[PDB]
Amino acid sequence: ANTPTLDSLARDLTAIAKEDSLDPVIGRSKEIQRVIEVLSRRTKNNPVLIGEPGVGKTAIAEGLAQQIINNEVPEILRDKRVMTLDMGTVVAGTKYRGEFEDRLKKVMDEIRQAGNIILFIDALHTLIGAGGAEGAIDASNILKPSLARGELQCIGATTLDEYRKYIEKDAALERRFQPIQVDQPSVDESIQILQGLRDRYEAHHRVSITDDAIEAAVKLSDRYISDRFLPDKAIDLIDEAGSKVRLRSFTSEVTVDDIAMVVSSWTGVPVSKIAQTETDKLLNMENILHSRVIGQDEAVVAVAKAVRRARAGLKDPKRPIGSFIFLGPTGVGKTELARALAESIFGDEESMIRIDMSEYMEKHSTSRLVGSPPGYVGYDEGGQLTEKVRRKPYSVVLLDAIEKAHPDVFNILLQVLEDGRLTDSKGRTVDFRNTILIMTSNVGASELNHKDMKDKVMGELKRAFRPEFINRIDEIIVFHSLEKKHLTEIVSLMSDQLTKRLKEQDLSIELTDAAKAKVAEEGVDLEYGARPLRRAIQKHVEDRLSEELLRGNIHKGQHIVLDVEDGEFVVKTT
């Protein structure tokens, strides 16, 4: 009473479990016991493991195979062979009338002449598709009569959304299968997982693994990788480190630096950001800021103090890290401070989720923010801000021109400031926990000694919008008077950037501070913001490159100095 075909096309977990070739199974005791409890029934023994990819469903199947041989089952499963199978391997051919149904009939005929096979199907949400879609002899329409009478015994393994989508075929498929929810393990659970089988990858790679190594593996896989679960991520980082260390040994100990190195190579943040700033990024974040940001030093030290206060603090993790509103004119540095801190908080930022609330002018415009109802226009994706954060829920949100919101949105804002994690989507609850909500404010420029401006702007907020609203917001970062010498300073910074760019193109330009001063005076007016300066320096540099390359007056490789010696830009190339 043996099974030729089923053994030919389905791996026998029991057989390779005899040989101790199977890796250990750690934890999951409650889940495996529940699996056995379901398998012990008489009519529908089939459990369907519902979780997320990479959580350890197949690990639970392996553990069950283990406990079978290791005399752990309650003698109703004693000597029963677990066989993993995949329908994809079964089908293998569709251009012919009945080949597939023939394979599956053979398989059923072997399950008959046996009692010890419990066929573990991975991703049985694909058990309904084969052959005709929903009106012909698919796989399910021939499994169901056997499944309902205990003829066949099974262990399915789906994903939650696949269960929800492909148990709309309820009638048979649901009642034939009992769900067993398996959830992804926590940090500590996963650390113990790893400590279970460190002596497997150690023996495979002949490399030594430390405990802080796997701690960093788990912490890193959580912080810097998403769209992948545990213990998958962890064991994968560990094994990648094992292989890479083995190679480096040729042309014997994995440590946290290697874990950082593999995570960096995966996601793209540099290694210096991951490892060394792990608890000192807040220690030098003010240095990072005052490097990237020039001016408004009082504002930047206020922000630094607030973020390190919330950072090395006991604040409720649930609600968002920082709620700051910048009062000031435009062009004073609102975005630069944001990008700088984000680059210092979430290293290598590219993360400021900017939203212009002046675009969400009116009442119904808030549906553009959250999304349309189901039976209405533009509902499928929608959710500008909601989908934006749902994508990467680890960043810094900047909301431009908070004033221009109709009062309809301030409600959503205060809900967010009420512990975040707002459910403002088509059934999606987005979480704003590690984020930082920042709001570009109104003019507020007229009020801008220190205490005077302060009381003024507080009253302007009283008159402007709710006191309760700012009672929600943490800090009021005031963007003081426009730049006077910081003008020339930011000219210098941009020109340093542009000189680097011009140098890597095999040139060298050095503009003296007199020309910098002239560009400063021209570019930005006293009333106007400091933004056109970008354009001003662009036009001057494009003119000089245009003329000098067109005229040919200059030769490549000769340093280029600009001055205002004649009252105009004079270029002395030599």
Residue 460 contacts its own copies per CB under 8 A: no
**In the chain, what are the helix, strand and coil shares in percent, each to the nearest 5?**
50, 10, 40
For residue 174, the minimal CB distance to its own copies (Å) is 8
For residue 236, the minimal CB distance to ligand ADP (Å) is 8
CB 214 within 8 A of CB 238: yes
Q: Which of 68, 147, 285, 332 binds ligand ADP (CB under 6 A)?
A: 332
Q: Which of 29, 43, 53, 559 binds its own copies (CB under 8 A)?
A: 53
> 53 a known binding residue?
yes
- In the list its own copies, ligand ADP, none, the entry touching 26 (Cβ below 5 to 8 angstroms by class) is ligand ADP
Residue 52 contacts its own copies per CB under 8 A: no
The enclosing H or E element of 456 equals helix 450-464
> 334 a known binding residue?
yes
Binding-residue total with its own copies (CB under 8 A):
15
CB 111 within 8 A of CB 117: yes
Angle at Cα 312 formed by Cα 309 and Cα 313, nearest 5°? 70
Residue 57 contacts ligand ADP per CB under 6 A: yes
- In the list its own copies, ligand ADP, none, the entry touching 235 (Cβ below 5 to 8 angstroms by class) is ligand ADP
For residue 233, the minimal CB distance to ligand ADP (Å) is 9
- In the list its own copies, ligand ADP, none, the entry touching 334 (Cβ below 5 to 8 angstroms by class) is ligand ADP
The single-letter DSSP state of residue 118 is E
Q: In DSSP terms, which residues pair with 476 in a beta bridge?
A: 325
Counting DSSP H helices and E strands in the chain, the numbers are 25, 16
Residue 54 contacts ligand ADP per CB under 6 A: yes
C-alpha to C-alpha distance for 344 and 351, rounded to whole angstroms: 11
For residue 170, the minimal CB distance to its own copies (Å) is 7
> 333 a known binding residue?
yes
Q: State which residue, 26 or 152, has the beta carbon closest to ligand ADP.
A: 26
Site for ligand ADP in 513-542 (CB under 6 A): 529-531, 534
- In the list its own copies, ligand ADP, none, the entry touching 330 (Cβ below 5 to 8 angstroms by class) is ligand ADP
CB 347 within 8 A of CB 288: no
The residue range among 50-58, 134-142, 367-375, 496-504 that interacts with ligand ADP, by the rule CB under 6 A, is 50-58
Site for its own copies in 151-210 (CB under 8 A): 169-175
State which residue has the least CB distance to ligand ADP.
333
Q: State which residue, 336 or 431, has the beta carbon closest to ligand ADP.
A: 336
- Binding-site string for its own copies from residue 8 to residue 47, where x marks contact by CB under 8 A and - marks none: ----------------------------------------
- In the list its own copies, ligand ADP, none, the entry touching 57 (Cβ below 5 to 8 angstroms by class) is ligand ADP
- In the list ligand ADP, its own copies, none, the entry touching 222 (Cβ below 5 to 8 angstroms by class) is none
Residue 94 contacts its own copies per CB under 8 A: no
Which residues does 453 contact at the CB level (< 8 Å), separation at least 6?
447, 478, 480
Residue 336 contacts ligand ADP per CB under 6 A: yes
> 54 a known binding residue?
yes
> 233 a known binding residue?
no
- In the list its own copies, ligand ADP, none, the entry touching 322 (Cβ below 5 to 8 angstroms by class) is none
Q: Which of 231, 242, 320, 444 binds ligand ADP (CB under 6 A)?
A: 231
Cis peptide bond prior to 317, omega within 30° of 0: no
For residue 478, the minimal CB distance to ligand ADP (Å) is 13
> 423 a known binding residue?
no
> 58 a known binding residue?
yes
> 27 a known binding residue?
no
> 196 a known binding residue?
no
**Residue found under tokens 């190679």:** 247
- In the list its own copies, ligand ADP, none, the entry touching 293 (Cβ below 5 to 8 angstroms by class) is ligand ADP
The single-letter DSSP state of residue 153 is -
Residue 294 contacts ligand ADP per CB under 6 A: yes
- In the list ligand ADP, its own copies, none, the entry touching 366 (Cβ below 5 to 8 angstroms by class) is none
The single-letter DSSP state of residue 280 is T
For residue 152, the minimal CB distance to its own copies (Å) is 12
- Binding-site string for its own copies from residue 112 to residue 131, where x marks contact by CB under 8 A and - marks none: ----------xx--x-----
CB 225 within 8 A of CB 233: yes
- In the list its own copies, ligand ADP, none, the entry touching 343 (Cβ below 5 to 8 angstroms by class) is none
CA 20 to chain centre: 38
C-alpha to C-alpha distance for 275 and 216, rounded to whole angstroms: 9
C-alpha to C-alpha distance for 56 and 28, rounded to whole angstroms: 9
Secondary structure in 3-state letters for 327-378: ECCCCCCHHHHHHHHHHHHCCCCCCEEEEECCCCCCCCCHHHHHCCCCCCCC
Name the 3-class secondary structure at 142.
helix
Order of strands across the sheet with 475-478?
352-356, 396-400, 436-440, 322-327, 475-478
User: Cβ-count burial of 426 within 10 angstroms (0-12 exposed, 13-18 middle, 19+ buried)?
Assistant: middle
* Token pair of 395 as six digits: 């960043």
C-alpha to C-alpha distance for 498 and 200, rounded to whole angstroms: 53
Which residues does 456 contact at the CB level (< 8 Å), separation at least 6?
447
C-alpha to C-alpha distance for 253 and 150, rounded to whole angstroms: 52
AA letter at 216 = A
Q: Which residues bind ligand ADP (CB under 6 A)?
A: 23, 25-28, 53-59, 175, 193, 231-232, 235, 293-296, 330-336, 490, 529-531, 534
Output the known binding site: 51-58, 328-335
Q: Which residues bind its own copies (CB under 8 A)?
A: 53, 58, 86, 88-89, 122-123, 126, 169-175
